[PDB]
């Protein structure tokens, strides 16, 4: 925020300007966007099963 290029600048999710992540502060952040391609099974009716993603850190520097 104390430099020319970063005067009053925000960071938000691509394509969704109303969801601001960072505003006028130094917070290193990465945004992972998820998109699904699916084929439902024929005749199967289901209500509320979850889709679970697990993240495991391998190396850091």
């Amino acid at each position: 925020p104390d430099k020319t290029g970063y005067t009053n600048t925000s960071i938000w999710v691509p394509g969704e300007p109303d969801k601001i992540i960072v505003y006028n502060e130094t917070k290193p952040v990465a945004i992972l966007n998820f998109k699904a391609f699916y084929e439902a099974k024929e005749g199967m009716l289901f209500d509320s099963l979850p889709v679970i993603f697990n993240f495991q850190v391998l190396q850091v520097g």
Binding site: V57, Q59, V60, G61
Partner: protein
């Protein structure tokens, strides 16, 4: 009568070494990274006072 040995003359001085050659006082800091991170940081300093008529010091 009296035969002097001509030895009873003396002059005396004193010597002392009451201080160690150096004094060390520490003003070090801290290293606070994240888990597994890579970085570098200044820790601090350490003052090494030099005592009377000491000119060269070899430390380990």
């Amino acid at each position: 009568t009296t035969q002097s040995p001509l030895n009873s003359f003396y002059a005396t001085g004193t010597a002392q070494a009451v201080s160690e050659p150096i004094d060390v006082e520490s003003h070090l800091g801290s290293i606070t990274p994240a888990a597994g991170a890579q970085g570098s940081d200044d820790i601090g300093y350490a003052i090494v006072w030099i005592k009377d008529q000491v000119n060269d010091v070899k430390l380990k």
